[PDB]
Amino acid sequence: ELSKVTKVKTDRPLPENPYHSRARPEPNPEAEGDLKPAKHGSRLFFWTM
Amino acid sequence: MLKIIIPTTMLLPMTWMSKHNMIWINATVHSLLISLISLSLLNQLGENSLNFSLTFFSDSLSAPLLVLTTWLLPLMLMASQSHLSKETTTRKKLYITMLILLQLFLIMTFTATELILFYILFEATLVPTLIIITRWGNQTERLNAGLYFLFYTLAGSLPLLVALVYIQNTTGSLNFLIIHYWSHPLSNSWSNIFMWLACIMAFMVKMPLYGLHLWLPKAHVEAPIAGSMVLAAVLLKLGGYGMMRITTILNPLTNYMAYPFLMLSMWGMIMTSSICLRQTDLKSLIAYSSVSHMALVIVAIMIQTPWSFMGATALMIAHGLTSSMLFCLANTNYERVHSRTMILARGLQTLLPLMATWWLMASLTNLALPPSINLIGELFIITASFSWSNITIILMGMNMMITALYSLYMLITTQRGKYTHHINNIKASFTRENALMALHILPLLLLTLNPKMILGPLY
């Protein structure tokens, strides 16, 4: 009975940033629309396809 | 352009699936047919090149060389029928396939639109050549000859690969048309100097520049007849074609960087002609004569005038034909006396009369007798160099004099004098050898009636 997890009814506000974390860096741009074939295929030297 | 490539490839299954009594016949028939078809490529436009597709194109420079290769393959087969008669069927088929692969690679070099594809195929030509030289050669020096040739070519060509890839990275493309239109001047920085060298030395090794020419005598002496034929007729002109193609992106640094090579070639022509004056081996004499003749083409390319380029193309075609015929004549003499010593067999003018006439005509073409295309090319190059500098005429005239001297000396030593008494195996010349000489000579004489065909794109 002394090991059970209890609810505590307090009035102090819940801390917004307990870790004092900085601003998370902006993520990289995420993808785009549909895929289309390469302009002229593999542009590797003399290969036309 | 596939109208020529596809039949060349189909030659291989044809020879592999042909009866042992019909490899040579079928090969000759269809190689001659391929040459007849490739004759259609000579209809070049005045200004624009024939752009068949994205990969292959042909201008007034590529077409004569393509025709020369397609015409030379049957000649090589006819010349190599003799000594490869007691070989097993599989090895005869292998030799024929090596020749066909060499011809195919040469066609795809002369037609390639991309510099890197041109490099790939022009280095791919080494493998069939090397195999031919080291497998069917007669002497024990064929092993060293193959190494010298292979390593000279590779040491010349690898920096060319590096430079081509660098140019692809910097300019964005290696296509000949784009690299010609989007051309830009090279500065005098050391980096541009070394890029110029990397682009130039590869072809300077191929058409032997004096100093880098040591592989040519070994290769031409130790190789079989057909191998010497290709090496002299097409594999040397590969360097000239590559240099004439790449000199577009090497200006204006050439004006100042060409002096060492110009002097080297203009002195090496005299040196090699003098060496021919004092040679004891017929094939070595012919090889050094080839070096001396290609020195003029090197000079013409390094001068970069329209007359120089026309003379270079004409000399390339003419020299290829003449050197191939000379090697064939020497091969006949060798197959008769089983030795390449020039002084061994003498007085052949009395035992083989028609072969003597063939020797005479070949020597006359070799010494640039008017109005042969040899003289057309030599005179155009001489005029271009005289315009470049009047002093050049001294070396040009001395070279012409020594060339006439050594050619007529070869004619006198071989086809003149008293017959060698002890030699008794000299039989009457076969129809095959005479036909080979006739097929070497008649196009050469006919080209003088229409020299415009082999005068290059600057005509």
Swiss-Prot record, chain B:
UniProt entry tagged with the keyword Transmembrane helix: yes
Name the chemical reaction catalysed here: a ubiquinone + NADH + 5 H(+)(in) = a ubiquinol + NAD(+) + 4 H(+)(out)
Alphabetized UniProt keyword annotations: Electron transport, Membrane, Mitochondrion, Mitochondrion inner membrane, NAD, Respiratory chain, Translocase, Transmembrane, Transmembrane helix, Transport, Ubiquinone
- The top EC class, named as a word, is translocase
One Gene Ontology cellular component: respiratory chain complex I
Looking at the keywords, is Metal-binding present? Answer: no
Primary localisation category? mitochondrion
Query: Where in or outside the cell is it found?
Result: Mitochondrion inner membrane
Residues annotated as signal peptide: none
Q: How does it sit in the membrane?
A: Multi-pass membrane protein
Query: Which protein are we looking at?
Result: NADH-ubiquinone oxidoreductase chain 4
Q: Which organism is it from?
A: Sus scrofa (Pig)
**Gene behind this protein:** MT-ND4
